[PDB]
Amino acid sequence: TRITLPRRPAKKIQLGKSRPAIYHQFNVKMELSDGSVVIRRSQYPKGEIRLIQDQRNNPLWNPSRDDLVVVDANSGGSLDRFNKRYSSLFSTVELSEENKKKTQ
Amino acid sequence: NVGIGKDHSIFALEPGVVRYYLDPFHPKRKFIGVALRRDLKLPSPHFEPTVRRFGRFELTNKRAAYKEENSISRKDYLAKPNILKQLEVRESKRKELQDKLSKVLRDELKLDIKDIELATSYLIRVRASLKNGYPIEDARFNSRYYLKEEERLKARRESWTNEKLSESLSKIDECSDLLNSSTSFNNKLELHQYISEQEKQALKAKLLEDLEKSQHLETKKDKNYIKALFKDACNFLTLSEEVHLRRKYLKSVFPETDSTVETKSGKKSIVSRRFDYTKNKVEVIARSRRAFLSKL
Amino acid sequence: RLMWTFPAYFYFKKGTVAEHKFLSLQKGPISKKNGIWFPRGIPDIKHGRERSTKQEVKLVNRPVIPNDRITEADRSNDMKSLERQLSRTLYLL
Amino acid sequence: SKNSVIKLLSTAASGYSRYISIKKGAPLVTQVRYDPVVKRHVLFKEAKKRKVAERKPLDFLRTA
Amino acid sequence: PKSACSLVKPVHHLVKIDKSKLSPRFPELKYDKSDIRSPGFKPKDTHADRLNDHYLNTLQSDLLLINYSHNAAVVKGLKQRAWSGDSPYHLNRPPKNPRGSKAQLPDIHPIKWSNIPGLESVVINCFVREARENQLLAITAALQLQQITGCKPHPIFSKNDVPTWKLRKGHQMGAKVELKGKEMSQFLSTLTEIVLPRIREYKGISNQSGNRFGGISFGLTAEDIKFFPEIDANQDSWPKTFGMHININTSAQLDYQARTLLSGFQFPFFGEEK
Amino acid sequence: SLSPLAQRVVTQLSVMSASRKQPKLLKLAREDLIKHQTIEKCWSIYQQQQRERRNLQLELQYKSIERSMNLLQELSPRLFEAANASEKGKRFPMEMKVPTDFPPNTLWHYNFR
Amino acid sequence: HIWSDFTTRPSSLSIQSSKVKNYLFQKKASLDPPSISRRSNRIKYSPPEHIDEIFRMSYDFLEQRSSKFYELANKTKNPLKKDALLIKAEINNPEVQYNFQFNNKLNNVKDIIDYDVPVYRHLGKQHWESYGQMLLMQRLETLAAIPDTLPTLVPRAEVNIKFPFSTGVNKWIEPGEFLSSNVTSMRPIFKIQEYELVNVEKQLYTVLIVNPDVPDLSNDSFKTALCYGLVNINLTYNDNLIDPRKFHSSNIIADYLPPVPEKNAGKQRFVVWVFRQPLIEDKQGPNMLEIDRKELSRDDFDIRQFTKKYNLTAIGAHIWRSEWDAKVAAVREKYGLPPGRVFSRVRR
RNA sequence: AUUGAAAAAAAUAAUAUAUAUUAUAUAUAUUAAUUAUAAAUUGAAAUAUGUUUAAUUGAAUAUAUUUUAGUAAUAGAUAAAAAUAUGUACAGUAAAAUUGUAAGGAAAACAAUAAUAACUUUCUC
RNA sequence: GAAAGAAUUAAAUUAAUAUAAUGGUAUAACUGUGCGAUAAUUGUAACACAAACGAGUGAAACAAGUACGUAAGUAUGGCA
Ligand SMILES: [Mg+2]
Ligand SMILES: [Mg+2]
Ligand SMILES: [Mg+2]
Ligand SMILES: [Mg+2]
Ligand SMILES: [Mg+2]
């Protein structure tokens, strides 16, 4: 009951014709969070990428960084909808109003 | 001198004395063998000639000897006639070559060689040697030494006197000397008058100049002139040079110049389209009649 | 020269606008054709690529502009700065 | 009853045959062996007709 | 066969012989793999490697200074123990097994210029257990390893038989790839640059992990592989993704040397050491 | 004919495969063959020379360490014990990072913590 | 440019063909390859890109390194060190490679491959060590030629043989090959190619051919018979084809006798052995030695005692085999020998 | 051979031609191919013939012809999971146990686990 | 001082051997691979082990043909 595609007669790679596998790759530039760019040899066909979050903006990798901007995936939620739909009620002064319930 | 079977049974291969021994080459392995003689210690020294036994005896009886000599493998028996026929075929070829060489020596040239048979045999051997990879100096000696052999050997077996060997060897020396200085082969293993190496260089240069100035081949008379120049070229050119020159000058299709390529007249051979990768378009090059060596 | 063929039939699905944009972005190879002579040899194309030579694949979203490797400290020849030589090792003398 | 006895007849019109065993439906057996009356190695084909088990051929050429 | 008895005849010369070079068959294996004339030829130094350079520039001398112990000596490993000669039964007795282990352990040499902890290989193990039913999914593993690592993946087939797990022996389930040289360097760099700094609860590599004599291993979950550039670009064509095992082999004699070494390549550690 | 999953996997297997996806063998003229050999020979020598230079530097560095250790031990054992202490848990500062092909927008930081 | 100058370096360290040199040293990709002759093939050929610039720098890199080695070679005095330094200086010259790999190494011409130059000597040694030496010793080993005749062999000089007079066809004999009685009926020649630095104005060689397979019905065993023997043969790195030109009747200690096997006497192995005479110093000119023809059994010949008595060191060897055929009788009568004996087909 | 560039050659081996010998050798010429093999209304590309725009010529453009797409694993003389269990030639060494690794645990897959005295080559002080 | 190679030494026959047990096997008889499908052929078989006879086991050698191997040589089914 296993899903297995039937195997065809394997072609004979006789001795001496064993060519290496050289997969098509592109000299692709990787743009980090900062202006740092590293050239990476990749198969996917497009030359530049931006990394929204990377080692640059990770506290674990930069313990000494006092200022560290943080950005996460933008699919929907706070940064997307909670902000534009609630663009009047403002502040962390306001966070001190709901600071504690003063309950044991 | 011992074997082993399917059941790992050890059995002797030659008569002798069975000894159990240990070979230093194979530690942790007992051995059994058969020394060819009682006084022989079986782990024979490595770097000493192996003790072999001929065993087989000689057939003194005349009838037994006759039977054995005339007893050959089926491969040899079946191949007996074919090889003999080829030998007869080649012997006839040698005979014809000898006849042809003698005719040209006496007729094409006017050299009075005293020994027709000896002179021809020297030359046919030289030709065969030259056909095979052999420089001219080596080829002449090889044939020379061969003839001088079968003469010292002939003297030994026929108990000839020293003087007879000396005169025969001298006679061979002069005939070869005369042949070398008066006969030669021209790029095809064909006999002709001797040509000096320095003269060969001079003739080669003259042909190269005479062939360079006439490379247009506009008219069939020029074609004949060029081909005529390639008549005695074999006398002073090696085959590699001869083929190279023909390829350079006897081009089947001449370079396409303005005269050779034209479309104003009709029946310009055929369209003869090709492809150009500069403009990435198909091209039409209608060749003219005076652009092919075959027609011109 | 030994590079393999690019499997465009996998990354670029059939009918995708990006797929058809890439096709136009590329330049096709010359194909073998009976009755036409070729000086450099009969074309050998498989999976839409000549097998006798290399293959060229032409490829906010602002363009990636790498920063210059020569800084202001380099041109100004300032010695106190820590950026005078980015690719080297600086020692405090 | 699993094995069977078959008579391999020399391809040369020699009349010399050799017998071998085989499974109930193994492929047709064809072997080269020495034939004494011709003094050479010749093919040996089956004499009678046997019901060979059906097998699927290999698709060396890409199909569908 | 008349007999089954292997016995090589001794020779009478010192010249080393190799029947491969003097057999006319296979004229193309005679050429070395690196040779241009071989069909197996593949360029090696296409471009410079930044990670390797970093190790040879900065971390090389640093590690020598770190690990150096003054007048340290070689610590012999647990070897086989010889039989003390006090009975006539020890003449051919095989030696005893090591003290606490059934396998001999290697010696630990002091760190010097010649031996400085450094990388040597990285192996990706991917065992899709779900392939027991759908074999076709094992191919997706090879593609995933190929796209990410960038090298040809060698497939992984079953070896054991556990009925409780519906495990059958002799079926393909995963792929593995051996990485060395520059390509391994790129993988290690792109792992720490991109994939690692994208897990929400990531703390680092456990200090308890690692073979006693060099070698450190960790594992990436199914969702972590989506962070690779070559899957993030084509999420449409990657409906299913699944984890793998990573093993970094190094020239470190002991583990703690390797951990210090890998830390230079931007690897974090969180647990407590042994 | 065949399930869509099989079609997709066949394509993925196709990307793996080498069928009708490789060029003709690289053939070089006899003289370019000698050209290539001399190129590689220089590169082999050049890499060996760089490697030997690094090894020789490390030779001297170790020589310097031990002479420093020997002198520190004879003069002031109080500091020597601290110097010879193990570094089992030593870790490079994570702020140090492998060089990048091109510099960042901010080259350096003058504030810490 | 040490490699460019020719004030003292031999001309052999150069490409004789000008067109080849011009392309190999071309500054721009403007000359087509010489090797490919047909212009159609010339058009089809495509050189790899960026191969000229890197080659030029690679050439310079080696050029400087060669210059350093030559300077070092100038200041030394030991000939063995001097030869090693020279080989080390020029082994990387592209011209030297082109000259060697691409032209005959056996029948080398003095213009291209000169064996007086240390570099070509070294390259030839390595080449012969790759295939020729490896094949020779296997033939001598598996044929039991070594222990039967000599304790061992340590090759130092390629040896090749031929029978140009017998039939007139040129073919270098592969070791261990099977030869008819006609082919080996007249005489062998030798090409003792040396590769080790040796004083070729003083050193002398000997050549012996032995057949340790002649039946000995007295002891029901075999005995070794000397086939052909030459002593006091001079040699030269580039002219080392021993032939009747290069030796006289004084050198022949045993005139050549053809391989003449007997019917059903089994295969007979003819092992060519090439030694070198002792080199005694404190004397001008070669050390001619007078062989003792007195004993010289040539019927029951003991090579081991012969070598020990005259202090000869073996450097090369060759082997061929012969069996009975129809031509043996003709050979016997040609050389005036008794008719061969006929043996049985079985051993008892 | 014609096809953009302005006398040749001196290796092994392959191919084509020829011929010397009771020798599977020599002479000349040139360095092919090396992952393929039928079957596609439909996808892609290409050349040729016209048109429109924009001499030439860029783009689009209709047709004819052809080529790519049948997309399928071994790329290593492969080496302890499965299939060819008798011949020959070449080559290699298993297994347990231990330490680790996302699911993974006692049991799935991967990695590591005895010592370099002497020798050759290369680089280097 | 370093890199590579040839490798050496120790341990190992507990894994594996179509199949029980025993003996053998790393020089592998175990495993991988190219060619192959050939010797899983054909007439004389001396001589031995074993043995009451009938039978059984190993096999030198002569002759014909085939496969592999550059060659030496191996193959008359399976390590016994
Ligand atoms: Mg068995
Ligand atoms: Mg057992
Ligand atoms: Mg008895
Ligand atoms: Mg009986
Ligand atoms: Mg077997």
Swiss-Prot record, chain F:
GO annotation terms (biological process): mitochondrial translation
Coiled coil: none
Locations listed in the record: Mitochondrion
One GO cellular component, as annotated: mitochondrion
Molecular function in Gene Ontology: structural constituent of ribosome
Major localization listed first in the record, in broad terms: mitochondrion
Alphabetically ordered keywords of this record: Mitochondrion, Ribonucleoprotein, Ribosomal protein, Transit peptide
Top-rank taxon, per record: Eukaryota
Function: Component of the mitochondrial ribosome (mitoribosome), a dedicated translation machinery responsible for the synthesis of mitochondrial genome-encoded proteins, including at least some of the essential transmembrane subunits of the mitochondrial respiratory chain. The mitoribosomes are attached to the mitochondrial inner membrane and translation products are cotranslationally integrated into the membrane.
Subunit note: Component of the mitochondrial large ribosomal subunit (mt-LSU). Mature yeast 74S mitochondrial ribosomes consist of a small (37S) and a large (54S) subunit. The 37S small subunit contains a 15S ribosomal RNA (15S mt-rRNA) and 34 different proteins. The 54S large subunit contains a 21S rRNA (21S mt-rRNA) and 46 different proteins.
Additional detail: Present with 6300 molecules/cell in log phase SD medium.
Family that this chain belongs to: Belongs to the mitochondrion-specific ribosomal protein mL40 family.
Protein name: Large ribosomal subunit protein mL40
From Swiss-Prot, chain G:
Molecular function via GO: structural constituent of ribosome
Alphabetic keyword roster: Mitochondrion, Ribonucleoprotein, Ribosomal protein, Transit peptide
Keyword Metal-binding: no
Cell compartment(s), UniProt: Mitochondrion
Gene3D superfamilies reported for this sequence: 1.20.58.1180, PEBP-like (3.90.280.10)
The keyword Ribosomal protein appears for this protein: yes
Pfam family, one: PBP
GO biological process: one example: mitochondrial translation
GO cellular-component term (any): mitochondrial inner membrane
Main location: mitochondrion
General remark: Present with 7700 molecules/cell in log phase SD medium.
Assembly and oligomerization: Component of the mitochondrial large ribosomal subunit (mt-LSU). Mature yeast 74S mitochondrial ribosomes consist of a small (37S) and a large (54S) subunit. The 37S small subunit contains a 15S ribosomal RNA (15S mt-rRNA) and 34 different proteins. The 54S large subunit contains a 21S rRNA (21S mt-rRNA) and 46 different proteins.
Family: Belongs to the phosphatidylethanolamine-binding protein family. Mitochondrion-specific ribosomal protein mL38 subfamily.
Classification via PANTHER family: PHOSPHATIDYLETHANOLAMINE-BINDING PROTEIN (PTHR11362), PHOSPHATIDYLETHANOLAMINE-BINDING PROTEIN 4 (PTHR11362:SF82)
Function comment: Component of the mitochondrial ribosome (mitoribosome), a dedicated translation machinery responsible for the synthesis of mitochondrial genome-encoded proteins, including at least some of the essential transmembrane subunits of the mitochondrial respiratory chain. The mitoribosomes are attached to the mitochondrial inner membrane and translation products are cotranslationally integrated into the membrane.
Protein name: Large ribosomal subunit protein mL38
